Curated annotation (Swiss-Prot), chain A:
Cited function: Component of the membrane attack complex (MAC), a multiprotein complex activated by the complement cascade, which inserts into a target cell membrane and forms a pore, leading to target cell membrane rupture and cell lysis. The MAC is initiated by proteolytic cleavage of C5 into complement C5b in response to the classical, alternative, lectin and GZMK complement pathways. The complement pathways consist in a cascade of proteins that leads to phagocytosis and breakdown of pathogens and signaling that strengthens the adaptive immune system. C7 serves as a membrane anchor.
Family: Belongs to the complement C6/C7/C8/C9 family.
Subcellular location as annotated: Secreted; Target cell membrane
Gene: C7
Natural source organism: Homo sapiens
Subunit structure of this chain's protein: Monomer or dimer; as a C5b-7 complex it can also form multimeric rosettes. Component of the membrane attack complex (MAC), composed of complement C5b, C6, C7, C8A, C8B, C8G and multiple copies of the pore-forming subunit C9.
Listed name of the protein: Complement component C7
PTM entry text: C-, N- and O-glycosylated. O-glycosylated with core 1 or possibly core 8 glycans.
From Swiss-Prot, chain B:
Entry protein name: Complement component C6
Implicated disorder: Complement component 6 deficiency: A rare defect of the complement classical pathway associated with susceptibility to severe recurrent infections, predominantly by Neisseria gonorrhoeae or Neisseria meningitidis.
Function: Component of the membrane attack complex (MAC), a multiprotein complex activated by the complement cascade, which inserts into a target cell membrane and forms a pore, leading to target cell membrane rupture and cell lysis. The MAC is initiated by proteolytic cleavage of C5 into complement C5b in response to the classical, alternative, lectin and GZMK complement pathways. The complement pathways consist in a cascade of proteins that leads to phagocytosis and breakdown of pathogens and signaling that strengthens the adaptive immune system.
Compartments where found: Secreted; Target cell membrane
Subunit structure, as described in the record: Component of the membrane attack complex (MAC), composed of complement C5b, C6, C7, C8A, C8B, C8G and multiple copies of the pore-forming subunit C9.
Residues carrying covalently attached carbohydrate according to the record: N29
Superkingdom of origin: Eukaryota
PTM field: All cysteine residues are assumed to be cross-linked to one another. Individual modules containing an even number of conserved cysteine residues are supposed to have disulfide linkages only within the same module.
Length: 50, 50
């Protein structure tokens, strides 16, 4: 199970670290700490009918 | 007097189909500048704390 909030992932550190998500097509502000946050999609489909 | 009739028919039908597709579409390419690259602030920090 995922448990409760441990890291402050919205600590911006005074930076204006915009990222454009091509997926959501919107500008988002990353926290100062996060090493990367990226939006490339992967879609991984198993059908198995018998 | 005796009469005998027998008719037997059997059919076995076997079918298999296989398709593998592997498209790789490039839409963009880049070259990074050789010199005076602008390091990621978080990377610049990580280096400064070494």
């Amino acid at each position: 199970q995922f448990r409760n909030r441990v890291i402050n992932t919205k600590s911006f550190g005074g930076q204006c670290r915009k990222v454009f998500s091509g997926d959501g097509k919107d500008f988002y502000r990353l926290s100062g700490n996060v090493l990367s946050y990226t939006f490339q999609v992967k879609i991984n489909n198993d059908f198995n009918y018998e | 007097n005796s009469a005998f009739k027998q008719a037997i028919q059997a059919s076995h039908k076997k079918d298999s189909s296989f398709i593998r597709i592997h498209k790789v579409m490039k839409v963009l390419n880049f070259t990074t500048k050789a010199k005076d690259l602008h390091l990621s602030d978080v990377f610049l920090k990580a280096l400064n704390h070494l």
